[PDB]
Structure 1
Amino acid sequence: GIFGAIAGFIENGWEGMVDGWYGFRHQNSEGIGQAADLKSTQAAIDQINGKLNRLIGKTNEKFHQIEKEFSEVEGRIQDLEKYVEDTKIDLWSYNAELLVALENQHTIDLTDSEMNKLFEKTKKQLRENAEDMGNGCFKIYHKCDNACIGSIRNGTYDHDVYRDEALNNRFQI
């Protein structure tokens, strides 16, 4: 949320994108298409797997401890045994609550970040050949067939090839 893309300027997610977490939809002379972006997808996944690696399968061994249930009333010593355990449980419960709240805030933010980073990268790549429509979409001011769209998605788009055409279309009356 803090970057402003996911649940922000991107109006909604795409239920029909099932082969990645982030990607591109386009419309050009040859149709309307969708493609996943693998690098951004893997960047988010790697970070979340990093959190999982620090939480899952990491337990501590304990053996003989103190008693925690009692059949008889005893007074002072038992009051202390119970208080030590209640103290411990409340501290661990607090740690667990905070851990999940913080980690979840951070996951939502880092995933929003990866969306924003992909958007920014694409904006820069297009140079003077496109304009940002405000909703995560670019209007590209030149003929941009499937190979051209592919070149943008693959980082091989040469903006100089199309710049004269695009400037003429952008700055007409």
Structure 2
Amino acid sequence: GIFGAIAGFIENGWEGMVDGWYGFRHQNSEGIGQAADLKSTQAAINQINGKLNRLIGKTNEKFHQIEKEFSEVEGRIQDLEKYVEDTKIDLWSYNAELLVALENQHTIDLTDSEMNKLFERTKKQLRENAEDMGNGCFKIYHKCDNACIGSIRNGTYDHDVYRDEALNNRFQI
């Protein structure tokens, strides 16, 4: 990915996560838990469904055309009919090959982007109360019970409440 999160500083994915595409794992005094993020998951899904709508279900009506198989040798005219159809098929085959390659590159990039957006979202929430460990994990420098983890997950974590506790633990000798 062009953002370096998926197959990058995120070492690997979570097969135990089945309720979403992106999410949070945490460890605190109350244990170790996992929860999915709905907004980022839905952002990636909607973009991919947008791709499919353009490509799926839309076909073209053709009725009377030219002949494309021949049982007799005719020469000039037949050569042109075969050439026209061969030319057509090669151009459409090229379009199909390029389309899938471009779409797949973009799909991999956009799912990597949603991972990075969630990471950035969370980093800004924590302000000065946490530090990035470099592998997609944050060390939070204050007591973080389950309700406090929940507040980070749905964007209601108030950093001022723990700032004094956190700065003391970060800048201790």
The TM-score bracket by the shorter chain reads over 0.9
Runs (4 or more) in structure 1 with deviation over 3 Å come to: none
Helix, strand or coil for the counterpart of 1:65?
Answer: coil
1:28-78 CA-partner distances (Å, limit 9, x unpaired)? 010000000000000000000000000111010000000000000000000
Aligned equivalents of 1:3, 1:74: Cα separation in 2: 59
Aligned equivalents of 1:3, 1:94: Cα separation in 2: 29
Shift of 1:104: 0.1
Aligned equivalents of 2:109, 2:9: Cα separation in 1: 15
Q: Which structure 1 segments of 5+ residues have no match?
A: none
1:151 aligned onto 2:151: yes
Aligned equivalents of 1:127, 1:14: Cα separation in 2: 27
Aligned equivalents of 1:106, 1:3: Cα separation in 2: 12
Shift of 1:81: 0.2
TM-score (norm 1): 1.00
Aligned equivalents of 1:124, 1:11: Cα separation in 2: 22
2:100 match: 100
Shift of 1:82: 0.2
Shift of 1:148: 0.2
TM-score (norm 2): 1.00
Shift of 1:147: 0.2
1:133-161 CA-partner distances (Å, limit 9, x unpaired)? 00000000000000000000010000000
User: How many residue pairs end up in the alignment?
Assistant: 173
Aligned equivalents of 2:137, 2:66: Cα separation in 1: 63
Q: Which structure 2 segments of 5+ residues have no match?
A: none
Shift of 1:96: 0.1
1:35 match: 35
Shift of 1:100: 0.1
Query: How high is the sequence identity, in percent, across the aligned residues?
Result: 99
